[PDB]
């Protein structure tokens, strides 16, 4: 009919890389997020925001380059190139951390575009959009960690910086300051990720070791045809094996595969909830009853009290360099240390 | 230790003494479990997405599969037609056997390397050490994110087992 | 009063019972420490 | 240990309310023809 329908036609043509309406959002934002990360890690410093080198140009390697967050004094500024901080100066913009909000915001809209792509393709080929539904977990993690968490804190400075070692620092900060391993929402995330990896391994291994012999080759991959009607492995044999080995087994293949969606997706959603709490410093930091007992009884010790001593070390030893805007000067005599070390 | 917080204690001390985060075998481990969880969700979602209609709108779709039936319960050609368009056609697994081999192999190999990470840091071959690796023209140290990690590692090191060390180096 | 044609029976099979009780009991085992604090 | 007194009632209802909900549904499923 009209131009909208003509445009719809061209957008949805079968081609090597499907475009679609969602592609108008997805491709520029994904490309800019990735390009921004490669640009920054190759050429851009963190000297003025963190006092850190962070690019190949300065001598970092793949593990230590990063696109780092802006200085704490930027607050939660969007840090637009044309905004009042950079005023259109591309060089100043890079020195101020503009590439971080650039990547985070284009990345977020790229993720929106990707999930729209999953809906759009599912609709076009005629399948239910559970893949898009499963992708809501990556999105909940990205939005809670890279947007909500810093928005509750003082500034973008305390968001994760986009780099390998920068992310490791983020992990360790969360242990020392938030006692994040103690948080029951993180624990559920761990169970969902590790249980997901378990399901991935056990399901793949089970199918591969209850295959029917559908060919003569000792390499068994060629004996499958995607259009075939028959199951390629024996669900009955798999069920008996696991019933006798483990006590219980799947018997419904539809439940099995739904469960494989459910477990890692729910785990990631739970971890996102804990991080929303950490945005407000609403931590599972302590057990009050442990602290009352330990304060009154200097012979009472548990692995919980041992870990808080580690956190106290992390905070005191890492904060002066990790939070340079605070101008912390901790004279040697105040640093917590055990004997000798 | 055989306990929840004891596990965290072991992890934090391990990071202080071996910089395990900077060890590539632990990084392969993370790719193993992050990837296992990703592909678990992916496979679950793709098979669930392509279930053949065998039920009415009210009952659970799980009724559409009967234990031990010979026919496959989903259309893998439809699932791969979706996934091949999500990425590109050749990035997708049309072969169920190849797909399920990959589902087994990716987490198993990653976790093998995780185990070997612990088992080789057991003999003190530790993660990469880039402490003070970047130096300016005069010789001032220019910190990187590796140096911040080091500062956190130091706080763990000096506080752990606070009454146990009498001499300046923690040699085991 | 005329019967409502939108009524439906509800079902929960034994496996779903076991799965649900496991979820509930493990959530309780996990969260109870924080409730006692 | 000086635990929160409401922890006991919180845990008990946390278990019992959803557990009985499932038991109610299971038993009335078994009794259907």
């Amino acid at each position: 009919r009209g131009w909208f329908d003509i445009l719809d036609d061209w957008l949805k043509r079968d081609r090597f890389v499907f475009v679609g309406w969602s592609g108008i959002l997805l491709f520029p934002c994904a490309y800019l997020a990735l390009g921004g990360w490669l640009t920054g890690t190759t050429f851009v410093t963190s000297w003025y925001t963190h006092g850190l080198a962070s690019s190949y140009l300065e001598g970092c390697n793949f593990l230590t380059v990063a696109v780092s967050t802006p200085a704490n004094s930027m607050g939660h500024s969007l840090l637009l190139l044309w905004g009042p901080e950079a005023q259109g100066d591309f060089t100043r913009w890079c020195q101020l951390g503009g590439l971080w909000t650039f990547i985070a915001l284009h990345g977020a809209f790229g993720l929106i575009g990707f999930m729209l792509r999953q809906f759009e393709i599912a609709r076009l080929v005629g399948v239910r959009p559970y893949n898009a539904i499963a992708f809501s977990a990556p999105i909940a993690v990205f939005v809670s960690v890279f947007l909500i968490y810093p928005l509750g804190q003082s500034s973008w400075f305390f968001a994760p910086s986009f780099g390998v070692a920068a992310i490791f620092r983020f992990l360790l900060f969360f242990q020392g300051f938030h006692n994040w391993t103690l948080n029951p929402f993180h624990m559920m995330g761990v169970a969902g990720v590790l249980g997901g990896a378990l399901l991935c391994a056990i399901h793949g291994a089970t199918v591969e070791n209850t295959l029917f012999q559908d060919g003569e080759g000792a390499s068994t991959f060629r004996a499958f045809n995607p259009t075939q009607a028959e199951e390629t492995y024996s669900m009955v044999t798999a069920n008996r094996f696991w019933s006798q080995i483990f006590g219980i087994a799947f018997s419904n293949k539809r439940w099995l595969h739904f469960f494989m969606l459910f477990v890692p997706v729910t785990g990631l959603w739970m971890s996102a909830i804990g991080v929303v709490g950490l945005a407000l410093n609403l931590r599972s930091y302590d057990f009050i009853s442990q602290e009352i007992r330990a304060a009154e009884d200097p012979e009472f010790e548990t692995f919980y009290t041992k870990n808080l001593l580690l956190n106290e070390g992390i905070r005191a030893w890492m904060a002066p360099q990790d939070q340079p805007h605070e101008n912390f000067v901790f004279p040697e005599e105040v640093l917590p240390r055990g004997n000798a070390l | 230790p055989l306990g929840i917080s004891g596990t965290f204690n072991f992890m934090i001390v391990f990071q202080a003494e071996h910089n395990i985060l900077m060890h590539p075998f632990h990084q392969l481990g993370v790719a193993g479990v992050f990837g296992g969880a990703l592909f678990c969700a992916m496979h679950g979602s793709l098979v669930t997405s392509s279930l053949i209609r065998e039920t009415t709108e009210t009952e659970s779709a799980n009724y559409g599969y009967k234990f031990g039936q010979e026919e496959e319960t989903y259309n893998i050609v439809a699932a791969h037609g979706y996934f091949g368009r999500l990425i590109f056609q050749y990035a997708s697994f049309n072969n169920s056997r190849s797909l399920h081999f990959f589902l087994a192999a990716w987490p198993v190999v990653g976790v093998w390397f995780a185990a070997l990470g612990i088992s080789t840091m057991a003999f003190n071959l530790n993660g990469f050490n880039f402490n003070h690796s970047v130096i300016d023209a005069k010789g001032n140290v220019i910190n990187t994110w590796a140096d911040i990690i080091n500062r956190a590692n130091l706080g763990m090191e000096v506080m752990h087992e606070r009454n146990a060390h009498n001499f300046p180096l923690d040699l085991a | 009063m005329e019967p409502n044609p939108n009524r439906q029976p509800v079902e929960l099979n034994r496996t779903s019972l076991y799965l649900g009780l496991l979820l509930i009991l493990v959530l309780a085992l996990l969260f109870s420490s924080y409730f006692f604090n | 240990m000086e635990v929160n007194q409401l922890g006991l009632i919180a845990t008990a209802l946390f278990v019992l309310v959803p557990s009985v909900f499932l038991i109610i549904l299971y038993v009335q499923t078994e009794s259907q023809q």
């Binding site: 009955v236 069920n239 019933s243 006590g247 219980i248 087994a249 018997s251 | 009967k66 234990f67 031990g68 039936q69 | 099979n13 034994r14 496996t15 076991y18 009780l21 496991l22 009991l25 493990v26 309780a28 085992l29 109870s32 420490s33 006692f36 | 240990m1 635990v3 922890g7 006991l8 845990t11 008990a12 278990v15």
Partner: peptide, 30 residues
């Protein structure tokens, strides 16, 4: 009281294991 609560929940889970295994809904071929 807290110890009793923790051990009670654990004991219920072990009982659940026993019923889920030995008093499962038996898989039937069709």
């Amino acid at each position: 009281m807290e110890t009793i609560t923790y051990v009670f929940i654990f004991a219920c889970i072990i009982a659940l294991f026993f019923f889920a295994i030995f008093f499962r809904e038996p898989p039937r071929i069709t």
